[PDB]
Amino acid sequence: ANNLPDTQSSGPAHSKETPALTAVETGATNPLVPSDTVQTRHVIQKRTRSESTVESFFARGACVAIIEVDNDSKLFSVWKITYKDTVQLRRKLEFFTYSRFDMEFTFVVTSNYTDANNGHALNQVYQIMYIPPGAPIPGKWNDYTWQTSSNPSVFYTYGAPPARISVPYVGIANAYSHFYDGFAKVPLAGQASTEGDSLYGAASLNDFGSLAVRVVNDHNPTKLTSKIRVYMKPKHVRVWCPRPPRAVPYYGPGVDYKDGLAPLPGKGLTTY
Amino acid sequence: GLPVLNTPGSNQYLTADNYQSPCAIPEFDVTPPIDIPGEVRNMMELAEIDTMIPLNLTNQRKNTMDMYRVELNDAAHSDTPILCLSLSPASDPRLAHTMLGEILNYYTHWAGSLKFTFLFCGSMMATGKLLVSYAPPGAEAPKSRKEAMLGTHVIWDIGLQSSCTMVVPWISNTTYRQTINDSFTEGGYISMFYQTRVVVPLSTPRKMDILGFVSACNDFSVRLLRDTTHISQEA
Amino acid sequence: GLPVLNTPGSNQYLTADNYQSPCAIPEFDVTPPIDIPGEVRNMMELAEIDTMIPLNLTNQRKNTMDMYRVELNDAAHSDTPILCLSLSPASDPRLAHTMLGEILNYYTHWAGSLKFTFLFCGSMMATGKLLVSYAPPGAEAPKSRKEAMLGTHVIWDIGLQSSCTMVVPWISNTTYRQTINDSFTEGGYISMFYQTRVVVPLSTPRKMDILGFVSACNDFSVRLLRDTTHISQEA
Amino acid sequence: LFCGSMMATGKLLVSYAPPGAEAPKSRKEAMLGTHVIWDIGLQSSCTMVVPWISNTTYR
Amino acid sequence: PSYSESKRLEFVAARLGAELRDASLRMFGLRVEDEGSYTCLFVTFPQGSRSVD
Amino acid sequence: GAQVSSQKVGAHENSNRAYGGSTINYTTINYYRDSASNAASKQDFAQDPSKFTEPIKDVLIKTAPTLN
Amino acid sequence: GAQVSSQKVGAHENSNRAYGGSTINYTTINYYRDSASNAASKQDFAQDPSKFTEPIKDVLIKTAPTLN
Amino acid sequence: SVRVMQLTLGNSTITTQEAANSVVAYGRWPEYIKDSEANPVDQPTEPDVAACRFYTLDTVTWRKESRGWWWKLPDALKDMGLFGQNMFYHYLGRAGYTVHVQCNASKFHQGALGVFAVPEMCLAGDSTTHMFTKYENANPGEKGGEFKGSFTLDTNATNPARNFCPVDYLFGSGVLAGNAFVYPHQIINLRTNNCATLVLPYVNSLSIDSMTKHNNWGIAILPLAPLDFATESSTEIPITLTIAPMCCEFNGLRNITVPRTQ
Numbered sequence A: 001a002n003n004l005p006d007t008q009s010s011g012p013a014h015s016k017e018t019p020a021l022t023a024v025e026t027g028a029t030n031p032l033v034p035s036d037t038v039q040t041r042h043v044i045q046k047r048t049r050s051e052s053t054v055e056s057f058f059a060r061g062a063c064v065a066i067i068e069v070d071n072d073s074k075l076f077s078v079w080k081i082t083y084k085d086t087v088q089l090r091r092k093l094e095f096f097t098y099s100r101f102d103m104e105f106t107f108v109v110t111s112n113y114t115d116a117n118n119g120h121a122l123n124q125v126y127q128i129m130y131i132p133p134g135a136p137i138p139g140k141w142n143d144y145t146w147q148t149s150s151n152p153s154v155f156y157t158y159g160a161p162p163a164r165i166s167v168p169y170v171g172i173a174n175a176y177s178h179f180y181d182g183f184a185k186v187p188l189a190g191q192a193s194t195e196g197d198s199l200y201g202a203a204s205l206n207d208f209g210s211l212a213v214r215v216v217n218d219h220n221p222t223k224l225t226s227k228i229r230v231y232m233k234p235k236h237v238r239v240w241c242p243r244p245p246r247a248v249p250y251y252g253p254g255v256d257y258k259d260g261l262a263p264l265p266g267k268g269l270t271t272y
Numbered sequence B, C: 001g002l003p004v005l006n007t008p009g010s011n012q013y014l015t016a017d018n019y020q021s022p023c024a025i026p027e028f029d030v031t032p033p034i035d036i037p038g039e040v041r042n043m044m045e046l047a048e049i050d051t052m053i054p055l056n057l058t059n060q061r062k063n064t065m066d067m068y069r070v071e072l073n074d075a076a077h078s079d080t081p082i083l084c085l086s087l088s089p090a091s092d093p094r095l096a097h098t099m100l101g102e103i104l105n106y107y108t109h110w111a112g113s114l115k116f117t118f119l120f121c122g123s124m125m126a127t128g129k130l131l132v133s134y135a136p137p138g139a140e141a142p143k144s145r146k147e148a149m150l151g152t153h154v155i156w157d158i159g160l161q162s163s164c165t166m167v168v169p170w171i172s173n174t175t176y177r178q179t180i181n182d183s184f185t186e187g188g189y190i191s192m193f194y195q196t197r198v199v200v201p202l203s204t205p206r207k208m209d210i211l212g213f214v215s216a217c218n219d220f221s222v223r224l225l226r227d228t229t230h231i232s233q234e235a
Numbered sequence D: 001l002f003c004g005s006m007m008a009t010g011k012l013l014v015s016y017a018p019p020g021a022e023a024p025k026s027r028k029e030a031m032l033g034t035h036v037i038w039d040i041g042l043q044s045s046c047t048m049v050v051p052w053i054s055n056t057t058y059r
Numbered sequence E: 001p002s003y004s005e006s007k008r009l010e011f012v013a014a015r016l017g018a019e020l021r022d023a024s025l026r027m028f029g030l031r032v033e034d035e036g037s038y039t040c041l042f043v044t045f046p047q048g049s050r051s052v053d
Numbered sequence F, G: 001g002a003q004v005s006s007q008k009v010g011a012h013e014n015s016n017r018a019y020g021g022s023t024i025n026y027t028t029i030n031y032y033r034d035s036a037s038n039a040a041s042k043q044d045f046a047q048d049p050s051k052f053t054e055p056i057k058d059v060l061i062k063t064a065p066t067l068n
Numbered sequence H: 001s002v003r004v005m006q007l008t009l010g011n012s013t014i015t016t017q018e019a020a021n022s023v024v025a026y027g028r029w030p031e032y033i034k035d036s037e038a039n040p041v042d043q044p045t046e047p048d049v050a051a052c053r054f055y056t057l058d059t060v061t062w063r064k065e066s067r068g069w070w071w072k073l074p075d076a077l078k079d080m081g082l083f084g085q086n087m088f089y090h091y092l093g094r095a096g097y098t099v100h101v102q103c104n105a106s107k108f109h110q111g112a113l114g115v116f117a118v119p120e121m122c123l124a125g126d127s128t129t130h131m132f133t134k135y136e137n138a139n140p141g142e143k144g145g146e147f148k149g150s151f152t153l154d155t156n157a158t159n160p161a162r163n164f165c166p167v168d169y170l171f172g173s174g175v176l177a178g179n180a181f182v183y184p185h186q187i188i189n190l191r192t193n194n195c196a197t198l199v200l201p202y203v204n205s206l207s208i209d210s211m212t213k214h215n216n217w218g219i220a221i222l223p224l225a226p227l228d229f230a231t232e233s234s235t236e237i238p239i240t241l242t243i244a245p246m247c248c249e250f251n252g253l254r255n256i257t258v259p260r261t262q
Ligand SMILES: COc1ccc(OCc2ccc(COc3c(Cl)cccc3Cl)cc2)c(Cl)c1
Pocket: A064, A081, A082, A083, A093, A099, A103, A105, A128, A129, A130, A152, A153, A154, A165, A167, A170, A176, A177, A178, A208, A211, A232, B024, B025
């Protein structure tokens, strides 16, 4: 996040040192600066790379999900936690193979009457319950699971500033894997083809669990719908192994492609 | 309690704010880190790595491996350009999709020097001298070697060292340029010509390819994070 | 008053927050404590106590005192397993309801070593050697003593010391495993075989039981508190 | 010693397999024993050392 | 398809790809390993980390 | 009356602030007279499980024979 | 437990306060025990791109012949 | 000089007279797990010279029409001597590698091969079903696979191939191939060098993992400039791949794993 070096003045040359010539076969990039190939003046550099630090690049709340609940089973909804339901944050994360950070979740809740001239309801309160992989998932908008004696819940009152909570680095590995070239199972010799088969590039069937959202108020016959837009921001970021960015449209959770396979336009070789 | 006064901006949600919030999973035993190879601290580190340029975007070559190959031949000397490009790293179709261009499309401003490296993939028996040029904006885009030679240029002699780098110095009026095609912040023209000609003996291929690479210099910086147009989502 | 700005998260109720609040019964004369025996500081203390495993969940034995008894006999040597188990402490039906399994079901991740102790309840006149085994995941689950003997194992000689402990070391790829049946974090197999055979003289019972116990080692830990599926409430 | 012309190039694998197994008949078997991958060029020759690997003190 | 250990099971769904689930299970065998009861619970990106016994 | 404790940093930012200074400390001040109003400090200690794991009168070594 | 850092002043007001004093400093205090609750300090460091730009075994000088 | 080298590992030596230096991925040389980064508690096995030696996989042939080749590690070495034995006998395994690609021609030939080492090299499949490629197809072993010039969707619903369909210009994963230079690499330009040498440390988000379930590195070879000779439309030059595992350590010994095949 710092300063750039100054440009030193450089005069003419006539020597056996040729920085302009190189050999990219080695796998290295030629570290030339302007003064290597032209005469330069002294410039005191004041520009910095403060905004391109790994932290500043991700320091934005991106939408990862839009959970919908109809307060007239739709009285409650469950969202399997992921960053792949949307494309924008996903593409930025995928510039790297591994990552490690904390997360900040902000929830923007909106609601409205479906009918322009019918129904009425008192102010709604929402419960956003996190169900860690293993915990019982709600079957009804009002069954015993909503007691949350151990699961973390967030109760949001409609109209209040967006709710917000922080989550630590929760991975079971030392870093989050954006790419996993493997399987969760190894098919063994002799077992039925139905056996030992698993998805390519998938780890746990339930990585991070899911969110169960519901309106706590008793539902009125009035037609109402609410949407909880989930925004996530990685804070305290560290990333490893850069990768080229996604060039063609995403086709699922994997690196699969199908449709926009011809991303580049035509342009004449000798056309400026 | 302590008397307070709520100021405008209260209860809002700025997508770019930086505040504290309660932890939903308190006292969690966080898995410690390990020293994984290849850690990155700044996005500009990635912009400084040579990435191959898709120079040949002709209808038959675009979106194939041929878009990266620019063919040369042993024909008699000509003053016509081998290739032409505009210094619009984030918007020119040939630069916009390189690693450098991809990163620039997440920012609104860019400033700094760039360098273009060309690799000769002909046989060892092939020789030749080429002129790589850069013309700052404001005049007619060079169409002959005679005009190109009047601007910044490097005369590349082919031999043992297979590649040649031409640095495009930061010559600008504004302190930062925009990542969109805009005349006010236009960057100039890059072109290549034959200085002499490619010469090969008998029993040797008379046509060969050259590959181009682009990377940022150590004085390169970008600012104003924005969203890219390189990724979309229908429905 | 003092100018303030309300940040997002204001007026919410995080079920896992940790704030102060006014006391509804101020100046209350609290009854002082007494030194009651058996105080607990950490839930892991309970996971380190041996608890009997319901190993025999066959239809006639499950949910009876017989689910805890695994019967042996003085038959000639066989290479077939006496019992088989999967190292899924929170999900395997035989482990999920032990004190260890009960606690693991209130957490999402577990890591550490475990130990299985077996008690021989035959007569004093009975002798025998048994092989207790643990095979890390990835290969075929052992079905003969020949395969089991290739992994971690303890050859138990029966005599004065009635019990034998086999430690299942922490051998994992991930830093923590999940408390659900998931192949990515699978733990391996536990099995028992006859090394020689149980031998008894005349006028002595030819069949006897062994009881199994499971507890966590001192390097065992769990994280991410969650709700258990072991308790429900209808209406 | 390579006695081809200067214009000739090539890479060869010289191998040594201690006794006891099947004598190598493919490069795949030979490559599992002691071997030197010879790249032809300026230095015309290549040496492969057959180390003393024996059970007896003398053969 | 992952067999959580009850060796006497058969799973028949168009898996490793997707469908989605109108899956059929089978328990052989062949003894009266009876009931008791059984449940069938699914997971969903929208609301559906839930089902019915 | 402020209590300043240090946090156990999990994920580290590419800053020196993530490794030292007041940037890895947190501050606390009690506003209520009754201790019941206080939050939980969560700086909780552990103990020896022996009272449960080995409530034996005559102490025994694992290497040595239990039944002697 | 307050952390006092200085700001990098961009646009300067016609004041001496715009050039010095606590007027170009900002104050921070952590209120939560878990480091996850903390904001980002943003005083982030940089590094050498060499691991990517020149992952070469035998180090080479730009003035000197790459292929030697 | 930058051009002459000799690599010795165990009982195997490789010599080259036309190198273009060597690349050490991310500047990290392979190493063993330190006690501070250790996870499995059991004593590891370290075969050393028996496993850390040069193994030559099958030779492929480069023609004017070739699109490219790919391999996965440790997969390509699963049947290689004692390295493969240790891989299958242990639940966990870790290793680094020295990849040496060989390709000689003559002074009248042209062509350039881009040799890339990619961590977590996930490839694209052939069906509309996501992540449908089956284990047997994803792990070809020493023979590896090939890149294609175009995407062709498998439509046989009765018998889906469940294979990869790596399009070359899309780097087999939906990214542009010209940007693959951000990964450790070397280029074998026929007018300059004979080979490419890359030293790869162990890269993963864990200290040790299952070698049968997970491939850490992928080796991709793409013709950047096609093969051409004198006037022979007909030209074929072999490309031999020699890889040596380094700092091998395995944990969790049991009975041997025998994976399902074809
Ligand atoms: C590589 O990029 C990643 C890695 C992990 C991720 O998710 C991990 C994750 C785990 C648990 C929770 C649970 O968080 C919550 C809690 Cl406790 C309470 C209330 C609401 C929420 Cl929301 C949320 C996210 C994401 Cl979104 C991107």
